[PDB]
Amino acid sequence: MVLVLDFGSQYTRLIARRLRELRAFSLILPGDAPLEEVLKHRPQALILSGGPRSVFDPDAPRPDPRLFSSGLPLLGICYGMQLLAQELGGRVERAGRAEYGKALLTRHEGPLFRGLEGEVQVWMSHQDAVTAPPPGWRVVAETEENPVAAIASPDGRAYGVQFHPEVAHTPKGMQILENFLELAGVKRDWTPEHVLEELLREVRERAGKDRVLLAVSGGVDSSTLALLLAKAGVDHLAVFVDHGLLRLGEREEVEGALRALGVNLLVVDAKERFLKALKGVEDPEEKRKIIGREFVAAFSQVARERGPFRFLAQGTLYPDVIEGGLPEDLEFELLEPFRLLFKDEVRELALLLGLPDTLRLRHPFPGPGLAVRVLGEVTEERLEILRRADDIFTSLLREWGLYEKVAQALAVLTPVGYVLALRAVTTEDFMTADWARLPLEFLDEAARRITRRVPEIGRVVYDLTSKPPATIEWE
Amino acid sequence: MVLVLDFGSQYTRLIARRLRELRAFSLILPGDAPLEEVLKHRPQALILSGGPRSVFDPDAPRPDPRLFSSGLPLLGICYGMQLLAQELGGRVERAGRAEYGKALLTRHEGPLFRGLEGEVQVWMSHQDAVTAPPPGWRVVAETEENPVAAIASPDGRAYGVQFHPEVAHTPKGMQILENFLELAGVKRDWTPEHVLEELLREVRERAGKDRVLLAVSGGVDSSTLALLLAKAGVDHLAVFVDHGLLRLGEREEVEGALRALGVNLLVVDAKERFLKALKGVEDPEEKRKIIGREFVAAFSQVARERGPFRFLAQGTLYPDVIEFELLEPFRLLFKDEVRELALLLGLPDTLRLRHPFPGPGLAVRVLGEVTEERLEILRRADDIFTSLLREWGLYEKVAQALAVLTPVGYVLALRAVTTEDFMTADWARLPLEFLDEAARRITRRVPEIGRVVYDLTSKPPATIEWE
Ligand SMILES: O=c1[nH]c(=O)c2[nH+]cn([C@@H]3O[C@H](COP(=O)(O)O)[C@@H](O)[C@H]3O)c2[nH]1
Ligand SMILES: O=c1[nH]c(=O)c2[nH+]cn([C@@H]3O[C@H](COP(=O)(O)O)[C@@H](O)[C@H]3O)c2[nH]1
């Protein structure tokens, strides 16, 4: 268990994910947290993230002084390296500006850097500088502008880096993090079989003879949660609400696979209800309000009729922890087996649970579905048009091997006569995303087939906007 | 002057243009024209185009038999090669279906294939087929499935080809047409100075000392016309009607260059008129109608307030051909040829190499009703797109670029195409890195634009403009 002490860096979650990609469990904890707190979990190592403020800024978070006196192997990143320096007898001074930049390490030596030969580009932090490492420590790295890009204690237990190894701009950062783990002798217990073993155990003990209620959307999160309950053999009822806003053929694909795998599934046909409720509504916020409201209604009705249900399982993920509404009279005990996992780790568990690639590798799709993909009132005719265009887009992407090369793809119908907007992005965290640069020949093919097979569509465009400044969905 | 006999081919205008590119004047005439009409222009050579209907089709166009016994060098293309066959003893039979196809000539010999070595890809017509050439002719070309790709007369003055040498899909087609002109001994009098001289003379005589009124829009066409009049010492009143729907700084660039060149220019401020007249209107149709009505009103008023004007000069072009006396000195030219004259008339590249811009201007580029605010948003986005295109050296690599403002809050659609004739058009495959730069610069510098989009639609099925 490696502890990530968060000092505000926008890459903190990233640090935690990289550790797991190196088969080490990672947990995040605010930087300024009592020593008893950071230790109560038995950290095998510690990592001090960076932060947007200078170590000179009084508002900037400070760790527990005792922290540096625990004997725990530790790595300091940017702000973290500077904290480590001044807090131990080294000298840090103001310099540069709070910004990043690519830089080549003109010197990189010692165990922290093995495997890294040739050019070693790093994503340097330009805010301040340690000009003197703690007395007795070694400067194991430099760039042209900074004679001290990394430091290490004489016993090889603590290290500091003036750059971000968890970021893509430091292509060899993973190896550096891997060297650190190897150095701190961190056990690599974070494997999928280990996770599965634990979750089944837990879910069985907790659920007991009782029955679990769960909502299923088609997404891989809830699907894997369903498979978990079934495989664990706990009594449960998975509820799939067909709001009639799903992609072409989605309901059948989902119901067929989950049932074949053994989940007690109940499909609710609420298409008419949702469409009715959505009549004349353009405001995307209102659409979501209405969708959320119709959904909690049909779901509660099911819970009551098929009840009682002692537990309500949810697919809460670690990102949710680190930051609809059921009727008050409906009381449930929460079962959240994935609360310490990242989305991709659940996709891995799905593999061990027997979920087929058809569903295990599909892209995320929103709760309000196609309703947020028609700019304007949602009508049955508009959905029929968007469903068709969307289907053709997804199929071409799969045909040309491009589907697995984007994090998400979608089509948006814009009434004029219709203009269809194709949209695909690349992202890890869905919180910053770049427009996907699909081949021009592919875009031409997608546009010709759409206007060809869906004559109501008179023009096709491709969204060139990243996030920031724009959202992934158009509304 | 080479004559093109039109038998219906969608590539007929292309044939005419290629010849000009080969410095030979060219004119088009219906394929079923009287021999007398065909010969009054004293053509040095004739070219029979292709056509959609079979030579067996009774309603299909027929030439004047005598035309084949006129002693003039001729080239029959597809449907044209068929006529050439049957009308002279050869045999032509039904085959395949009216469609085209790329094919390699398995053999190509003769002065018609002079210089076309290596492989020769042609765009073959699959509608019927010459199975036997006229007696005495030589099948100087073949393909895999078709033994008679091209035929040549024994006198080496007539030729037929089962492919379209005028289309890009026949890469070396221009060389074949060049070889035929050489054979035909065609003189190359189609040069810019000859055109300018001829045009200065005419304009001068036709107008004499009367008053000729012409409208300048900003387009290289109107501008060149204005410069032609001035250069010819003709008395004119160039009228530039600023409807307030132009591109950033367009008016200042046009009046400054035209005045500096000697054009008697009068710019009319009608910004308000057009703006007020367009309030609340969204129908693309109405906009154009409204804009047109307002322009005439504005133009008519100056025609009177400063009349009388015997002549009304217009920049009518050949493709067009294909209380006022009209003076159209360009009706036999293509736009590109007018750009060439504009060079000789000393027009600066800044206005001489600009992409076309519609009369309704930005009014047809606002998906919805036009307003001053929306216009300002669009004008700044449009400006940025143009500038980036010029900076990257892409502006000259596309036939037209434009931006459409879609009120949603605004989504902006970038749109560029490549075209020969604006009557077909492909969406321009701009570099991905470039579109990224364009999208970021726009949302950054024009905050009201929250999303930038790129149009992937060709013509057909869609129009170049969004309305
Ligand atoms: O379950 C959902 N209900 C919603 O209302 C919703 N809105 C956006 N999304 C998804 O979240 C990610 C980010 O989309 P945005 O950049 O537009 O916020 C993308 O993956 C979106 O598909 C939703 N998911
Ligand atoms: O003078 C003009 N007045 C107009 O109303 C107009 N509408 C379209 N265009 C131009 O004509 C070409 C083809 O545009 P479309 O494929 O949308 O018809 C393109 O070059 C268009 O810019 C216009 N020019």
mmCIF file of N, CA and C in Angstrom, chain B residues 1 3 5 27-30 32-43 64 66:
data_model
loop_
_atom_site.group_PDB
_atom_site.id
_atom_site.type_symbol
_atom_site.label_atom_id
_atom_site.label_comp_id
_atom_site.label_asym_id
_atom_site.label_seq_id
_atom_site.Cartn_x
_atom_site.Cartn_y
_atom_site.Cartn_z
ATOM 1 N N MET B 1 -8.953 28.614 -83.625
ATOM 2 C CA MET B 1 -10.211 28.329 -82.874
ATOM 3 C C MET B 1 -10.693 26.905 -83.123
ATOM 4 N N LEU B 3 -13.483 23.888 -82.389
ATOM 5 C CA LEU B 3 -14.883 23.774 -82.042
ATOM 6 C C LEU B 3 -15.200 22.451 -81.353
ATOM 7 N N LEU B 5 -18.259 19.998 -80.418
ATOM 8 C CA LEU B 5 -19.645 19.661 -80.722
ATOM 9 C C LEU B 5 -20.214 18.921 -79.526
ATOM 10 N N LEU B 27 -14.866 26.903 -78.645
ATOM 11 C CA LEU B 27 -16.254 27.272 -78.511
ATOM 12 C C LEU B 27 -17.061 26.006 -78.565
ATOM 13 N N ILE B 28 -18.211 26.037 -77.914
ATOM 14 C CA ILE B 28 -19.082 24.883 -77.891
ATOM 15 C C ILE B 28 -20.330 25.127 -78.733
ATOM 16 N N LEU B 29 -20.742 24.093 -79.459
ATOM 17 C CA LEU B 29 -21.934 24.162 -80.286
ATOM 18 C C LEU B 29 -22.700 22.869 -80.136
ATOM 19 N N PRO B 30 -24.031 22.927 -80.265
ATOM 20 C CA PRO B 30 -24.808 21.691 -80.139
ATOM 21 C C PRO B 30 -24.278 20.706 -81.170
ATOM 22 N N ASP B 32 -25.876 18.699 -82.966
ATOM 23 C CA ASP B 32 -26.752 18.677 -84.127
ATOM 24 C C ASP B 32 -26.855 20.040 -84.798
ATOM 25 N N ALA B 33 -25.734 20.742 -84.902
ATOM 26 C CA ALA B 33 -25.734 22.055 -85.529
ATOM 27 C C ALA B 33 -25.611 21.919 -87.041
ATOM 28 N N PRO B 34 -26.137 22.900 -87.790
ATOM 29 C CA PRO B 34 -26.050 22.848 -89.253
ATOM 30 C C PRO B 34 -24.583 23.006 -89.641
ATOM 31 N N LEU B 35 -24.160 22.324 -90.697
ATOM 32 C CA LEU B 35 -22.777 22.416 -91.129
ATOM 33 C C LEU B 35 -22.406 23.861 -91.436
ATOM 34 N N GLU B 36 -23.357 24.609 -91.985
ATOM 35 C CA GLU B 36 -23.111 26.007 -92.319
ATOM 36 C C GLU B 36 -22.781 26.817 -91.067
ATOM 37 N N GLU B 37 -23.527 26.571 -89.996
ATOM 38 C CA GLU B 37 -23.325 27.271 -88.735
ATOM 39 C C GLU B 37 -21.975 26.863 -88.143
ATOM 40 N N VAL B 38 -21.680 25.571 -88.205
ATOM 41 C CA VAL B 38 -20.426 25.046 -87.687
ATOM 42 C C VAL B 38 -19.201 25.641 -88.365
ATOM 43 N N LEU B 39 -19.296 25.891 -89.664
ATOM 44 C CA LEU B 39 -18.156 26.401 -90.411
ATOM 45 C C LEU B 39 -17.969 27.914 -90.506
ATOM 46 N N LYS B 40 -18.982 28.695 -90.140
ATOM 47 C CA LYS B 40 -18.840 30.145 -90.242
ATOM 48 C C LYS B 40 -17.737 30.683 -89.343
ATOM 49 N N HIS B 41 -17.397 29.943 -88.295
ATOM 50 C CA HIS B 41 -16.341 30.378 -87.386
ATOM 51 C C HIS B 41 -14.971 29.944 -87.896
ATOM 52 N N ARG B 42 -14.964 29.255 -89.030
ATOM 53 C CA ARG B 42 -13.730 28.773 -89.636
ATOM 54 C C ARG B 42 -12.836 28.039 -88.635
ATOM 55 N N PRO B 43 -13.318 26.907 -88.099
ATOM 56 C CA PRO B 43 -12.543 26.126 -87.134
ATOM 57 C C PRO B 43 -11.363 25.424 -87.792
ATOM 58 N N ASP B 64 -24.178 16.531 -88.443
ATOM 59 C CA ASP B 64 -24.511 16.721 -89.845
ATOM 60 C C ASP B 64 -23.538 15.826 -90.595
ATOM 61 N N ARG B 66 -22.420 15.647 -93.566
ATOM 62 C CA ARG B 66 -21.454 16.417 -94.349
ATOM 63 C C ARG B 66 -20.254 16.840 -93.507
#
